[PDB]
Design a protein around this ligand. Sequence first.
Ligand code: HEM
Ligand SMILES: [Xe]
Ligand SMILES: [Xe]
Ligand SMILES: [Xe]
Ligand SMILES: [Xe]
Ligand SMILES: [Xe]
Ligand SMILES: [Zn+2]
Ligand SMILES: [Zn+2]
Length: 153
Amino acid sequence: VLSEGEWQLVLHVWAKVEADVAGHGQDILIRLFKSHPETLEKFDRFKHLKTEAEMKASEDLKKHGVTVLTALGAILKKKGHHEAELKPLAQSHATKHKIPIKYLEFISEAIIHVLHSRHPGDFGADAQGAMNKALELFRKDIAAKYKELGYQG
Ligand code: HEM
Ligand SMILES: [Xe]
Ligand SMILES: [Xe]
Ligand SMILES: [Xe]
Ligand SMILES: [Xe]
Ligand SMILES: [Xe]
Ligand SMILES: [Zn+2]
Ligand SMILES: [Zn+2]
């Protein structure tokens, strides 16, 4: 697990995301889709977007970015005691959206990239390491639920 000092790094950085949830959310989803266009295919809602300019122009995509970061923020704020918040998410992503664990790894990389881009002064290697650990813990617990339900990977 994360040490107290590492959770402090994560939660203090997260406060910076909360100062502009829509901007960070938009940037993270665009970075995911550009870096890994195969992830687009999983969203019937977005698969029509073919270019980066189209992604930037979509109000619906910006709305979903808020949904994603609001859910992730609720989880991080539980400092690992996130069973009630994580369960519904693991269920829907395994059984309904059918999202492989690898794509959760890809979105974790996009989050780190955007935090670095937006906060070059604030988000040094120690915070980056701590954020990586927090997202790993998130993935580990989702993966366990996937395995339970017979999806895993
Ligand atoms: C940071 C990790 C992620 C969080 C916190 C997250 C959160 C959510 C939330 C809260 C919803 C709406 C409720 C629901 O259906 O459960 C949702 C919908 C969805 N998510 Fe995720 N998600 C994450 C990663 C991903 C990834 C990597 C993909 C695909 C590559 C994905 C695919 C979807 C799809 C297809 C929907 C349904 C969208 C719609 O048609 O309305 N999610 N996500
Ligand atoms: Xe996001
Ligand atoms: Xe998820
Ligand atoms: Xe994640
Ligand atoms: Xe972010
Ligand atoms: Xe987490
Ligand atoms: Zn890829
Ligand atoms: Zn707008």
